[PDB]
Design a protein around this ligand. Structure first.
Ligand SMILES: [Mg+2]
Ligand SMILES: [Mg+2]
Ligand SMILES: [Zn+2]
Ligand SMILES: [Zn+2]
Lengths: 1167, 74, 89, 99
């Protein structure tokens, strides 16, 4: 079968050096003149940087001279001025060239940090520049005389050396010499020479540097690149329209800086050509060559020499390297990142009437957005003769068009996005609802997921054009399909504030209210009692209710009873669907209980019932909250009656300790701390006074004498329900507020004795100011810290995607409760939930299999384990998964916005990174958000501890040489380990005991590198998760351990070989490649041997550095170095990743695209 | 030191300035050099006959007086 | 409207292959080639395909089968036309 | 603000408001990740190719929208197509191999 020739849809890409002849292939002509445009008629002058002959017609399908103006003539080359009449687009495509008189060095291969030309010739850089500037002569192919091949001579020395040997020895200077060296260089012969020398001399110092060079050389040999190409003979010119001269208003012109650069290179070059035919003296032509060299360098990458400046403007002219480069890496994909059609934006508002699956869309916005759809539908039914008439119709805004828009709008989701996109819920699909007005209406329950307040925040709209985008939006990005945070299984659609204050006020009970004690047939007639004004919303009442339990086999049982409840709870039951028990609504319904309600509803009835449920809860919450007439008055804030007394008593203590300091009974420092303690205790005292008074002090009467219940006072209801406010903020309102801190951080010893209900005087406010300003500053900075963290995180993971189904390994980690210092900082049920068992678990007794091998542990299975006493469960994790180049779905977990096991092809790395990064705003400024960054960066602490390197009996040897050696002695194994540890660090380790490998030989923090090396992979991964989870959990952030585990796996992605027989002995390399390779030896070729590796720990920012795709690396790294370092080796990028596929603009090899790429990947390496 | 401005000033600074007498010395050699080639051209038979064939083209209206001689010494 | 795709995800497990399959079917309907297998409520082809998945009358097997059937149904018409290409001889 | 099809920047073909029908909303890296967490491949391709950067694909699409055919014939975004010429403008030969 025949291959191909013309443009098919390409896969992969290759990059390499460009031959001079190869450069001529692209060039359709030589730019011979610095001239640009004619200066009167603005047409391009032939042949110049802008040329119709070389590049293309100025206007579409029209010859320059004007002889052939007809659209029919196409492949015709005009006889006057050869211009093939073709679309002006080809002026954006066709390249050109320039033939340089003298050779020229390519600055990228000269000045890249490991100078490429330098170490290829094994010659220093400073010398090479000295040869390019004609400051000395260099030898080439010395023959048998006096001289080294690469030796450098001076003027006098070259002459003296020349008198002895005239011929059979040759030396040059300048660019031609370096080019001659590279051409004369035989890489193959040099390779052989380097092979012998490795074996001959044995020294680490020697063969270390040695091995670096030989791999590089042979790589360049295997590459196919020939060394000469690092010196430019021919120079390609960029198409004119990519650096346009295009006119502006007022008749002035503007053009790209490249022109100023290109023009210069031409002039100087041309001048040199002239200077050859005039036989100028050496000193001049030398100076001209140097001038040409500087110009080419400035053109390619400016700033590596003098930083040449553009004409009349101080600011340095932007060169070709700076067009690619930027902040950061490339401008193309970096923030930000390209403008997009079919979009819009405006201020957003509430719209509580909306169902959770829809959103209010302004009329005008929808008109301008769907403009093409409106045109096409208008002429599909025949209301408009042709597309033009449709344009005039919508431009006239005729009344008939509004009905047509409802058709194109109906089933057609729109994407809503907010400004700081963090996790995937930052964009969600909704069904549009036409709304008069210029504001966007957004379902309240989603306002939590977007973290969108109403203080004037704006949101953006995107239209899903292609059919696949409609079904992607509807089945993935739809609002109703993500109700649960991917970070933790708790619902993120949880009612927020106003709604929950309603339900709290709804199901609550006072002591005496209208209708107390009566009985009703059912919830229906309960509402009939309330709405008519007979019964109070909260009164204790028995009513017949019908609850449900599905406890049969997939089948709903029904049960009825007389429940003791209130009127509000009775009415609310009408909403609760089917199989939920009445126990869930019988409580006071705070914000905490109201979330677990929604959660249970999802895990029992499924998705669909939960959605419609959630809507009803919101609607009823707002409604009843409005009925409640909740408000806040100045008399709603009750100050304790005992406050003034508490302040006075605490005021005596300070004068007591003060009396002790004047008489010297106590030191100055002890005094400060002392006063601060008594004042602090006072604050707690006042706080827990107003708390008692505020909470229960409503004391009311039912028929009998007195009694007291939880207060119905407004502000209290807010704090108790979970709607808004908390004991801390309230403490500032009624009781005294805190002890502020002076900028230096020393909490002031005279607290703020007043509060907001009273007035603050001059001083108290002035002292309060620092706390506010430092608060705002810290957050504004912590905003940046969070973003940077997510960046590094998603960079190190990204391309990680669920690929196989089950890798089939029994391996996994042991999950126990966190049990931190007191009692259970986190239970067992949360740690194992939604994960998969590593092996079958026993009861406390045995021959009883509870969970059969690998099974998803859902709510029932975790409760069945909890019924029994089971204290420990082994769980498959993403760090242990045997699948190479990905994660098996069985090792990950179920977690998603859906409860089902994770689908094949979902990209978990990104959602993992987003879940870890988003909460980082709430962390502190050891501990805090920077503490997390240190953990993921593997950074070694300042004064670390040391662990026993190997098991066996240890002892102390020699003496204090600034280090006192520690010698470990295994029983059977070899002794030789003796480490020199400075002894001025307090020891721990018992001098006379045998230590298991990895025990504590001293105190202080430990480097996570150790834990991996000595204790092992599972040990170190447990260390990271438990420590990082401590930081977040202390602040109340719920992040499932899964995400942290996937980040960890990428940290250890690389390993260092130990044994040999196929590979590079000491090379650090991917454990993915190795494991498939050592499997390729266990039964393949030669056993050989081999190879044993050692897992390595790379910090997040360091591990992301290594990426197979060079197009990916060129994005976030330093562009120049990446391109060079890849271009020499001829590396062939196969795509296969996410980052690279986004750049080139095709389907992501994940999710919906995963079917496509998979099917194509197999087509490759086949026939 | 890179900065090609520097490597020029230093490359030319080696050449030593001419004395007022030295100018004529070099200039005399030029005259000698050219006069050598002028006489060498005068010694070629084809150089004469060619000039003849060229002047016959001038008189034949195949050329102009400006395209052959710039004027004579006398 | 179709509020939750949960039912379709049960019929085809992946939930991504659901988007693909429903897409392929939705184009068979959108570009005027076939008709719905179930009452259209005025729902656009996006949602009509999903109902067909929920009701279990459309999936990847049937479509490949159905398409493979149409291949032979058109190959039957052109049967005489293409055998007339004996001009190869 | 709202825009369907507006003007375009010359240097890189991208939506730009010249009439005060303002250029479209800027779709970012963080927003790209948001699409990557969901399984939506086609939305992302259409976002950075036909809806913005593809000087061909945009017109081939628009004609299909009025015709009643929802599809995309994506092609290569002009941003990346320029990056190829800038690299090739240097001494670097960058080719698209195979098939
Ligand atoms: Mg809010
Ligand atoms: Mg705001
Ligand atoms: Zn012409
Ligand atoms: Zn696995």
């Amino acid at each position: 079968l025949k291959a191909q020739t013309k443009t098919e849809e390409f896969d992969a890409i290759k990059i390499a050096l460009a031959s001079p002849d190869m450069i001529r292939s692209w060039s359709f002509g030589e730019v011979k003149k610095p001239e640009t445009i004619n200066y009167r008629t603005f047409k391009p002058e032939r042949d110049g940087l802008f040329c119709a002959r070389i590049f293309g017609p100025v206007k579409d399908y029209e010859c320059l001279c004007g002889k052939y103006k007809r659209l029919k003539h196409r492949g015709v080359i005009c006889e006057k001025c050869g211009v093939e009449v073709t679309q002006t687009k080809v002026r954006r495509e066709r390249m050109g060239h320039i033939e340089l008189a003298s050779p020229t060095a390519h600055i990228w291969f000269l000045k890249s940090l490991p100078s490429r030309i330098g170490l290829l010739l094994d010659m220093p850089l400073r010398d090479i520049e000295r040869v390019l500037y004609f400051e000395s002569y260099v030898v080439i192919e010395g023959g048998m005389t006096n001289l080294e091949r690469q030796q450098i001579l001076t003027e006098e020395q070259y002459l003296d050396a020349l008198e002895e040997f005239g011929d059979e020895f040759d030396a040059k200077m300048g660019a031609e010499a370096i080019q001659a060296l590279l051409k004369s260089m035989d890489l193959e012969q040099e390779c052989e020479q380097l092979r012998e020398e490795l074996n001959e001399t044995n020294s680490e110092t020697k063969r270390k540097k040695l091995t670096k060079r030989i791999k590089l050389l042979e790589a360049f040999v295997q590459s196919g690149n020939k060394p000469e190409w690092m010196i430019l003979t021919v120079l390609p010119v960029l198409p004119p329209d990519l650096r346009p001269l295009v006119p502006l208003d007022g008749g002035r012109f503007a053009t790209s800086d490249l022109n100023d650069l290109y023009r210069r290179v031409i002039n100087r070059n041309n001048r040199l050509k002239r200077l050859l035919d005039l036989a100028a003296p050496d000193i001049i032509v030398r100076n001209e060559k140097r001038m040409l060299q500087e110009a080419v360098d400035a053109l390619l990458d400016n700033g590596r020499r003098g930083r040449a400046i553009t004409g009349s403007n101080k600011r340095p002219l932007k060169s070709l390297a700076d067009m690619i480069k930027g902040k950061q890496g490339r401008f193309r994909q970096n923030l930000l990142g390209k403008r997009v059609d079919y979009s819009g934006r405006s201020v957003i508002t509430v719209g509580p009437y909306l169902r959770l699956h829809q959103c209010g869309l302004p009329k005008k916005m929808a008109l301008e957005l769907f403009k093409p759809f409106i045109y096409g539908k208008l002429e599909l039914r025949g209301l408009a003769t042709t597309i033009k008439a449709a344009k005039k119709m919508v431009e006239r805004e005729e009344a008939v068009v509004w009905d047509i828009l409802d058709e194109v709008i109906r089933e057609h989701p729109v994407l809503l996005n907010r400004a700081p996109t963090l996790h995937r819920l930052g964009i969600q699909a909704f069904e549009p609802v036409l709304i008069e007005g210029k504001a966007i209406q957004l379902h309240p329950l989603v306002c939590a997921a977007y973290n969108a307040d109403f203080d004037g925040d704006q949101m953006a709209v995107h239209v899903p054009l292609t059919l696949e985008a409609q079904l992607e939006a509807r089945a993935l990005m739809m609002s109703t399909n993500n109700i649960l945070s991917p970070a933790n299984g708790e619902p993120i659609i949880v009612p927020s504030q106003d709604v929950v204050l309603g339900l709290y006020y709804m199901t609550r009970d006072c002591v005496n209210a209208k209708g107390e004690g009566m009985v009703l047939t059912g919830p229906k007639e309960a509402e009939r009692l309330y709405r008519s004004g007979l019964a109070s919303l909260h009164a204790r009442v028995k009513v017949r209710i019908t609850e449900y339990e599905k406890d049969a086999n997939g089948e709903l049982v029904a049960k009825t009873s007389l429940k003791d409840t209130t009127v509000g709870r009775a009415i609310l039951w009408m909403i609760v669907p089917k199989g939920l028990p009445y126990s869930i609504v019988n409580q006071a319904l705070g914000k905490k209980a109201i979330s677990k309600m929604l959660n249970t509803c999802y895990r029992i009835l499924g998705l669909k019932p939960t959605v419609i449920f959630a809507d009803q809860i919101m609607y009823t919450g707002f409604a009843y909250a409005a009925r409640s007439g909740a408000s806040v008055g100045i008399d709603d804030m009750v100050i304790p009656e005992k406050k003034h007394e508490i302040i006075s008593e605490a005021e005596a203590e300070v004068a007591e300790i003060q009396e002790q300091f004047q008489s010297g009974l106590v030191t100055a420092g002890e005094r400060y701390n002392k006063v601060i303690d008594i004042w602090a205790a006072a604050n707690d005292r006042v706080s827990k006074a107003m708390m008692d008074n505020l909470q229960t002090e409503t004391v009311i009467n039912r028929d009998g004498q007195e009694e007291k219940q939880v207060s119905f006072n407004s502000i209290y209801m807010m704090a108790d329900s979970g709607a808004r406010g908390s004991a801390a903020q309230i403490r500032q309102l009624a009781g005294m507020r805190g002890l502020m801190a002076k900028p230096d951080g020393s909490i002031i010893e005279t607290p703020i004795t007043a509060n907001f209900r009273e007035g603050l005087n001059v001083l108290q406010y002035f002292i309060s100011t620092h706390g506010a300003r430092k608060g705002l500053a810290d957050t504004a900075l912590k905003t940046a810290n969070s973003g940077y963290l997510t960046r590094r995180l998603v960079d190190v993971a990204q391309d990680l995607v669920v690929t196989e189904d089950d890798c089939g390994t029994h391996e996994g980690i042991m999950m126990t409760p966190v049990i931190e210092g007191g009692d259970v900082k986190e239970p067992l049920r949360d740690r194992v939930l939604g994960r998969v068992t590593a092996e079958d678990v026993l009861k406390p007794g045995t021959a009883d299999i509870l969970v059969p091998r690998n099974t998803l542990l859902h709510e029932q299975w975790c409760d069945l384990l909890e019924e029994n006493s089971v204290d420990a469960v082994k769980v498959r994790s993403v760090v242990s998964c045997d699948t190479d180049f990905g994660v098996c779905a069985h090792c990950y977990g179920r977690d998603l916005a859906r409860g089902h096991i994770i689908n094949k092809g979902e990209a978990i790395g990104v959602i993992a990174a987003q879940s870890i990064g988003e909460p980082g705003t709430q962390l502190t400024m050891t501990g805090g958000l920077p503490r997390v960054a240190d953990l993921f960066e593997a950074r070694r602490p300042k004064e670390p501890a040391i662990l026993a390197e190997i098991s066996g009996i240890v002892s102390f040897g020699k003496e204090t040489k600034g280090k006192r050696r520690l010698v470990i002695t295994p029983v059977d194994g070899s002794d030789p380990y003796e480490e020199m540890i400075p002894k001025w660090r307090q020891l721990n380790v018992f001098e006379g005991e045998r230590v298991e490998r990895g025990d504590v030989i001293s105190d202080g923090p430990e480097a996570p590198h150790d834990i991996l090396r000595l204790r092992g992979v599972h040990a170190v991964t447990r260390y990271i998760v438990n420590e990082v989870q401590d930081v977040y959990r202390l602040q109340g952030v719920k992040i499932n351990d899964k995400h942290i585990e996937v980040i960890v796996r990428q940290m250890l992605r690389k390993a260092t070989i130990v044994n040999a027989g196929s590979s590079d002995f000491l090379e650090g390399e991917q454990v993915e490649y190795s494991r498939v390779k050592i499997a390729n030896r266990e039964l393949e070729a030669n056993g050989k041997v081999g190879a044993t590796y050692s897992r390595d720990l790379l910090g997040i920012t360091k591990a992301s550095l290594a990426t197979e795709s060079f197009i990916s690396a060129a994005s976030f790294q330093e562009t120049t170095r990446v391109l060079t370092e890849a271009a020499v080796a001829g590396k062939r990028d196969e795509l296969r990743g996410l980052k690279e596929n986004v750049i080139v603009g095709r389907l992501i090899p994940a999710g919906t695209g995963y079917a496509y790429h998979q099917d194509r990947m197999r087509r490759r390496a086949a026939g | 030191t890179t900065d090609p401005v520097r490597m020029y000033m230093r490359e030319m600074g080696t050449v030593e300035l001419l004395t007022r007498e030295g100018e004529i010395d070099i200039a005399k050699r030029i005259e000698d050099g050219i006069n050598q080639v002028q006489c060498s051209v005068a010694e070629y038979p084809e150089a004469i006959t060619y000039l003849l064939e060229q002047y016959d083209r001038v008189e034949a209206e195949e050329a102009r007086l400006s395209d052959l001689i710039t004027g004579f010494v006398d | 409207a179709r509020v939750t795709v949960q039912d379709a995800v049960e019929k085809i497990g992946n939930r991504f292959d659901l988007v693909l399959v429903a897409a392929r079917r939705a184009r068979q309907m959108q570009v005027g080639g076939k008709d719905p297998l179930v009452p259209e409520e005025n729902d656009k082809t996006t949602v009509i395909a999903l109902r067909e998945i929920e009701e279990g009358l459309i999936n990847n097997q049937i479509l490949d089968v159905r398409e493979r059937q149409e291949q032979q149904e058109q190959e039957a018409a052109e049967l005489q036309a293409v055998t007339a290409i004996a001009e190869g001889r | 603000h709202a825009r369907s099809t507006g003007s375009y920047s010359l240097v890189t073909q991208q939506p730009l408001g010249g009439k005060a029908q303002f250029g479209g909303q800027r779709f970012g890296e963080m927003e790209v990740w948001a699409l990557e967490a969901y399984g939506a491949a086609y939305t992302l391709q259409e976002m950075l190719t036909v809806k913005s950067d593809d000087v061909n694909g945009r017109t081939k699409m628009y004609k299909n929208i009025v015709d009643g055919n929802h599809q995309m014939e994506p092609g290569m975004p002009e941003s990346f197509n320029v990056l190829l010429k800038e690299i090739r403008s240097l001494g670097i030969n960058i080719e698209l191999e195979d098939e």
